[PDB]
């Protein structure tokens, strides 16, 4: 009854890129409130609902989605138990009636899903990660921090999209964060000393004019050494190839847009293997196309036992696609994007599926984020052991790391930081 | 009883630039908590306390400030009424006993001061702006958004540090903020069209390689038009010359470090005058040096009637320097930085001193900010009518804008957005 | 729930002069009540509703206003949040339908408005001044006490209406009030020694049979001296000339009704100038006619820099009139009378308008006062720094001074008494 | 326990004549507070404690008394049940040690006493009169209003000190009060037509220059008639002869300082005797000296059966003296002054004694009053049927009338207004 939902409101706020997004606030009978927001980054995912009014926000308004929260969703949810998130989510899914949340907007629906969970957690007097994962929630994730950018929207000749450091050697999340910031500032000073730009992209990382993937890797490795740390022992690398952007002439053929290098599906795999022998890269995301299933199969045989192979575009947090990958032995990890699926409970299910099949779940940010820190709690709640939420600059990134500090603090001696054992 | 402070804790979190800063949490007897943080950006201002340990965060840790909260400050404040913020602040000021808050750290002191205010507001069931400014608080501020950077650490030939748009034609903050994003994205596209860089600096704006202050201005004005808005009627401009960084051979002489142009104060002033006749510039911050008092007095005679002259370095949120300026007719506006003075109540006093004198008070962010949105509430609480808190990108900036949204919603018909009348 | 208005009731009480006025009591769901009253003394002002029945109170009954509260206004406000005084005021204003609150009666509307603020404050567990102005409220006002009377309804040859002392030398309101009482008794002892009447007028001040303004001033200056204080250092004088009572044959001409002395606007101004050079007079209310705008413009030019020129009849607490004053540079202060405008929220706006334009706002009593002490809180709430509320005798006057004592005490060290800096 | 006194504080406030007096606030464990103040006007009464510092308030400060409350009284009453007023008063009396409350100050003691009673009632959720007098309290008093002043401090030739009107014909206190105000304004008008002074003295009444007691009486009777009322039916008269100020050459002789007329004790009685035959005078206070007991005994024989003879100076609210009067059949009424006896309970006992013996008890103000309205509730709480609290002007007087309006309102149909039957 103190957990009974009284009213749900929506509002149009601005995300970290200067575009609108949806925020929801859930009010319970006891006067407790919860607040959630939808981040923003397809055909196999939930579709966020935008206004399309060219006279407002360049067509990116979300007043329609907001109106859906304020009228339909509120009426639907009023009277329900906010702690029963599965039932709340299901009421929204059934009322929406589509397969992709396109009536209400995946952004309206997620924002309310999160807001409720936060309302229930607060009403129960527990942290959100304890609400979501219970006493069994005690793993702090190893972050992969995207500190060097290439790919489609970077001003350089680097084809791979994200270059990430993972502090596998630290023994607390607090230590891992500190070290990451130290490597980050080392990289900045190094870029500066070489006359390169130290301004940042969407996820807080640098996008200097380097020659290639290899040079980017060596800049990062140098940054690591400059900060006083050892590649392999202290830091290893993860990458997001986003090779779905490298479409060649036909399936199984790849052309890097900048390098202009051409790869057979199986030669790309050979490329990844040489990169991984040369350098301490332990994870690669989207190392092949979102539909090169035959390729993924091969790559996972060839590399799966040593390298984490994360499906991002391959899976789009879709459990039918996750299942197909599991069954055909493609990938061994999945990038979890709350908003691609659209509800808290559906996300838990997706993560449960991955974990059951021995896949890791890397909880993920989007390019368009907010002050919201839900994914921090979510990663701990399900002991995912990994998170991808940006360089340690821009507070829509750093806010998640701060939340993980607080959580680690709160867990006391029960807190576990898995380091290299996390893969 | 229920407003009685039971305990104060601190923690080392990370700011928007990847450097440590202080967070405080205040716990009241009634179970309510409040959280505050210190932003980070001299000799006449309160001093932030850093650890200096090169092994941690390159010497920028704040574990000492945190230990000052956890022990000394908590013991001092326990038992005190959290709603009596003036008294809370005085207890910290007196127990510190320095002029620059260098015993506890101005960052430790500010963090606690904000956390108390937030705890008290929460315990009373009122929003922070109402706690700070009561029923009388209903003016939303006109933002000056720094979307184009020059000066110091910019990769360009522009000497002026910050070029800012102000949405003076809007009739609500919500509309003003929408328009600002629209101009933001139009500028981004303009820069892209001209092959310029659209990654961002600390405050979320672009630092493309532009040739002169004049060119920066025209790009912004072009952007305004592209967005569908008129210079003058919809948007005007504010700049931060930061002209203390233009020291000359003698006092009264200036040398722009990029331009290399030489001015005597009277000439520099005359320079500002031309710019202000050519372009819709309505405010210039630090148009002369932080000790060129005669020039300030002169400039204020020449310009103060038509242009807003903001003392940033001139005053360092210092009420002695402000008073001096007031007494000598220097400036007609002051940039208010919570952390330059170090407590909430002292900041109210600075703002009250300015207002009594007919100076405007521009509530301001620092280059290092966090998820904290206190300045949003502060701006509304004292009806300052102006806020300087960044481009509409990076959530440590945008979170403030989002908070002002929520506040405008909350005020309803009582909300006032002053636009062009705010000056 | 607990701030929700359940019921509003009105009653007919008696003011300090022995005439009826309106009292309101607001009842909230939580069990809390608030009590407010309307004081009383036009065409540009809100209009009080009197009954007109010569059978009762000589036509000055207020049972119609009281019935407006018990029925229409109670029905309208029931269910509303008493802390949203802007919304409450607005509902009343809109239901009334008139531009001057003539339907419900401005006495009815103000009474309820005050009663709600008091109810809200009490429900939130804060002093009225904290509810109105928040933490930012800490300025005790300098009183101008009307201890010697002339003008229309005084039996003496003195044309100037009010002669006031202001304790500018004191360091606390406590000290200030004490000195005021001491000068008050000294003057009485002086009048007694000269065979003059020491009975009191409406506002607690003496109306002894003196020859002229100049003599009145010299007696007060003598009282000051007798009491042990120095004119200038300790006490200065304020006057209300009420020169709208001095209308000449044509506009721009004045004839003092007793004196019979004649003036041109520009002549009357030189008269004030000399009085101010000769004596320590720092403020003059209505030094020119309520419609002699050109003369006010000129007077403000001539005297404005040295003297406070308070518009009372000039502005009638009307924002349109105050704005006209501001645009045409007439006066530099405004006498604020709650009941002339008729609601708490509109009074805040009027004061805000004044402060934004550099005018001071003197919170003021009416000739017909009650035990109510709202103006004491209002003055501290908006840090006006000045209050005009009678001689230190008669409890409808002294009650306010007593409330200021309690307020100062409650502020502890945060209390500011601006003494001479208030101007 | 919620009725337990936690803390008692005192404060120096200002009374209706501009002189300092004591206020007390009592704080109960449950968070409720009560406020009480001592009014101020001898050898047989309790002695108020003044500071005597000639450098403050002309020696009339009460900081010593206030410190007695803040330390000693507070320490003694802490932990006691505030509803047990008799015990609270006893604790204070015993701690004081003196017979006249001279150590703590009758002013400090009474202030606390009243504050507790008020706090207790609030804590119980009952009006003060119900607290004091229970369900049995429902008689509104008949007011005797001093609208014409003579005797000592008066610019006239009237020897009788107070001339009072009593609305005996009214059917409710509301009607009575209204009629009184109307007579008051008629007298003012009448007085003006005769060029006579209409400023007021301490108790809100006029002191014009009239020649004799008979004149005063006729003016009042004239006023009554002008207002539209009949002497006898609607209004009768009461008088405070204050004959103790007429000390003769020896006990039993009287000399009117103004008339210079000489009287033997028994001749004076004959004088009153005629007056009452000539005029509708139903009550005379202190018609003989405060020690002329044989006189009183005689007067009481002569007049007692037709006329109310009130002992003011005769009894000074002292039960020993009241008992003596009762035993020697002197007077048939007593003027009750709280601050003469010094506590609430002792006051109740005085009234109970008078009531026991068939005296009427007239609850009285002092010349130095405050916003406090305690005596209104006291009068109803003990169904005294009569109150003496001033002309209907000056809110230290009118506040009592207003409180009686509220009480009558709160009583609904159970309210009894006795009128003529009250004697
Ligand atoms: Mg990807
Ligand atoms: Mg600056
Ligand atoms: Mg006036
Ligand atoms: Mg007497």
Coordinates of C-alpha atoms in Angstrom, one line a residue, chain C residues 85-299:
Chain C
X85 CA 0.4 31.1 -2.2
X86 CA 0.7 32.3 -5.8
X87 CA -1.8 29.7 -6.9
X88 CA -4.1 30.5 -3.9
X89 CA -3.9 34.3 -4.6
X90 CA -4.5 33.7 -8.2
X91 CA -7.6 31.6 -7.6
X92 CA -9.0 34.3 -5.4
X93 CA -8.1 37.1 -7.9
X94 CA -9.7 35.1 -10.8
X95 CA -12.9 34.2 -9.0
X96 CA -13.3 37.8 -7.9
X97 CA -13.1 38.9 -11.6
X98 CA -12.4 42.6 -11.0
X99 CA -9.2 44.5 -11.5
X100 CA -9.3 45.9 -7.9
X101 CA -10.7 43.0 -5.9
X102 CA -14.0 45.0 -5.5
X103 CA -16.3 42.0 -5.7
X104 CA -14.8 39.8 -2.8
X105 CA -13.3 42.9 -1.2
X106 CA -9.6 43.5 -0.9
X107 CA -9.9 43.2 2.8
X108 CA -11.3 39.7 2.4
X109 CA -8.7 38.6 -0.1
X110 CA -5.7 39.9 1.8
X111 CA -6.9 38.4 5.1
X112 CA -7.1 34.9 3.6
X113 CA -3.8 35.4 1.7
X114 CA -2.0 36.2 4.9
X115 CA -3.9 33.5 6.8
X116 CA -2.7 30.9 4.3
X117 CA 1.0 31.9 4.4
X118 CA 0.8 31.7 8.1
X119 CA -1.0 28.3 7.9
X120 CA 1.6 27.0 5.4
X121 CA 4.5 28.3 7.5
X122 CA 3.1 26.6 10.6
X123 CA 2.4 23.3 8.8
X124 CA 6.0 23.3 7.5
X125 CA 7.3 24.2 11.0
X126 CA 9.1 27.4 10.0
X127 CA 8.7 31.0 11.0
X128 CA 6.7 33.1 8.6
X129 CA 9.8 35.1 7.5
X130 CA 11.6 31.8 6.6
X131 CA 8.5 30.6 4.6
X132 CA 8.4 33.9 2.7
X133 CA 12.1 34.6 2.1
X134 CA 13.8 31.4 3.1
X135 CA 17.3 31.1 4.5
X136 CA 18.1 34.3 2.6
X137 CA 16.0 36.3 5.1
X138 CA 18.3 37.8 7.8
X139 CA 18.0 41.6 7.6
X140 CA 16.3 43.3 10.5
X141 CA 14.8 46.6 9.2
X142 CA 15.7 50.1 10.4
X143 CA 12.5 51.5 11.8
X144 CA 11.3 55.0 11.0
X145 CA 9.1 55.9 14.0
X146 CA 6.5 58.6 13.7
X147 CA 6.8 60.3 17.2
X148 CA 5.6 63.8 16.3
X149 CA 2.5 64.5 14.0
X150 CA 1.3 67.3 11.8
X151 CA -0.9 67.4 8.8
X152 CA -4.6 67.0 8.1
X153 CA -5.9 65.5 11.3
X154 CA -3.5 67.0 13.8
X155 CA -4.5 70.0 16.0
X156 CA -1.4 72.1 15.6
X157 CA 0.2 74.4 13.0
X158 CA 2.4 71.8 11.5
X159 CA 1.8 71.0 7.8
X160 CA 4.1 68.0 7.5
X161 CA 2.2 64.9 8.4
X162 CA 4.8 62.5 10.0
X163 CA 8.1 63.3 11.7
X164 CA 10.1 60.1 12.1
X165 CA 13.3 59.1 13.9
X166 CA 15.6 56.4 12.5
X167 CA 18.1 54.7 14.8
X168 CA 20.9 54.3 12.2
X169 CA 23.7 54.1 14.7
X170 CA 22.5 51.0 16.6
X171 CA 24.2 47.7 16.0
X172 CA 21.2 45.4 16.7
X173 CA 17.5 45.9 16.2
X174 CA 17.3 45.3 20.0
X175 CA 19.5 48.3 20.6
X176 CA 17.7 50.3 18.0
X177 CA 14.3 49.7 19.5
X178 CA 15.5 50.6 23.0
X179 CA 17.1 53.9 21.8
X180 CA 13.8 54.7 20.0
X181 CA 11.8 54.2 23.2
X182 CA 14.3 56.4 25.1
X183 CA 14.0 59.3 22.6
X184 CA 10.2 58.8 22.7
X185 CA 10.0 59.4 26.5
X186 CA 12.5 62.2 26.3
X187 CA 10.3 64.1 23.9
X188 CA 7.3 63.5 26.1
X189 CA 9.1 64.9 29.1
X190 CA 10.0 67.9 26.9
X191 CA 6.5 68.5 25.7
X192 CA 5.3 68.2 29.3
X193 CA 7.8 70.7 30.5
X194 CA 6.5 73.2 27.9
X195 CA 2.9 72.6 28.9
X196 CA 2.0 70.6 25.8
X197 CA -0.3 67.6 25.2
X198 CA 1.3 64.2 25.4
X199 CA -1.8 62.2 24.5
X200 CA -1.3 60.2 21.2
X201 CA -2.7 60.0 17.7
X202 CA -3.6 56.9 15.6
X203 CA 0.1 55.9 15.2
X204 CA 1.2 56.3 18.8
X205 CA 2.9 59.6 18.2
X206 CA 2.4 63.0 19.8
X207 CA 0.5 65.9 18.2
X208 CA 1.6 68.8 20.5
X209 CA 0.5 72.3 19.5
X210 CA 3.7 73.4 17.8
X211 CA 4.3 76.4 15.5
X212 CA 5.8 74.8 12.4
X213 CA 7.8 72.0 10.7
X214 CA 11.0 73.7 11.8
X215 CA 9.9 73.8 15.4
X216 CA 8.7 70.1 15.2
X217 CA 12.1 69.1 13.9
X218 CA 14.0 71.1 16.6
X219 CA 11.9 69.5 19.4
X220 CA 12.7 66.0 18.1
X221 CA 16.3 66.8 17.8
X222 CA 16.1 68.1 21.3
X223 CA 14.5 64.8 22.4
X224 CA 17.3 62.9 20.8
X225 CA 19.9 65.1 22.6
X226 CA 18.1 64.8 25.9
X227 CA 18.0 61.0 25.5
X228 CA 21.7 61.0 25.3
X229 CA 22.2 60.5 21.5
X230 CA 23.8 62.5 18.7
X231 CA 21.8 63.5 15.7
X232 CA 23.6 62.2 12.6
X233 CA 25.7 59.5 14.3
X234 CA 22.8 57.9 16.3
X235 CA 19.6 59.3 14.7
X236 CA 18.4 60.8 11.5
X237 CA 15.0 61.9 10.5
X238 CA 12.5 60.9 7.9
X239 CA 9.5 62.9 7.0
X240 CA 6.2 62.2 5.3
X241 CA 5.1 65.5 3.8
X242 CA 2.0 64.0 2.3
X243 CA 2.2 66.9 -0.1
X244 CA -0.7 65.5 -2.2
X245 CA -2.7 67.3 0.6
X246 CA -1.1 70.6 -0.4
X247 CA -2.8 71.1 -3.8
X248 CA -2.4 74.6 -5.4
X249 CA -4.7 76.4 -7.8
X250 CA -3.1 74.6 -10.7
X251 CA -0.9 71.5 -11.1
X252 CA 2.7 72.1 -10.3
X253 CA 1.7 74.6 -7.5
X254 CA 1.5 73.9 -3.8
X255 CA -0.1 75.7 -0.9
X256 CA 0.5 74.4 2.6
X257 CA -3.0 74.3 4.1
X258 CA -2.0 75.7 7.5
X259 CA 1.1 77.8 6.8
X260 CA -0.6 79.1 3.6
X261 CA 2.9 79.3 2.3
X262 CA 3.0 78.9 -1.5
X263 CA 5.3 76.9 -3.8
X264 CA 6.2 76.0 -7.4
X265 CA 7.3 72.4 -7.6
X266 CA 10.9 73.5 -8.2
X267 CA 10.5 75.9 -5.3
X268 CA 9.2 73.2 -2.9
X269 CA 12.2 71.1 -3.9
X270 CA 14.6 73.8 -2.9
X271 CA 12.7 74.0 0.4
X272 CA 13.4 70.3 1.0
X273 CA 17.0 70.8 -0.1
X274 CA 17.6 73.5 2.6
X275 CA 15.8 71.5 5.4
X276 CA 18.1 68.6 4.5
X277 CA 21.2 70.8 4.6
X278 CA 20.1 72.4 7.9
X279 CA 18.9 69.2 9.5
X280 CA 19.9 65.5 9.3
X281 CA 16.9 64.5 7.2
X282 CA 17.7 61.4 5.1
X283 CA 14.3 60.5 3.7
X284 CA 11.2 62.4 2.5
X285 CA 8.0 60.7 1.6
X286 CA 5.7 62.3 -1.0
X287 CA 7.7 65.5 -1.2
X288 CA 5.6 66.4 -4.3
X289 CA 2.1 65.6 -5.6
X290 CA 0.9 62.2 -6.5
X291 CA 0.5 63.3 -10.1
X292 CA 3.3 65.9 -10.4
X293 CA 5.5 63.6 -12.4
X294 CA 7.6 66.2 -14.0
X295 CA 8.3 67.7 -10.6
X296 CA 9.2 64.2 -9.2
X297 CA 11.5 63.7 -12.1
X298 CA 13.2 67.0 -11.3
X299 CA 13.2 66.5 -7.5

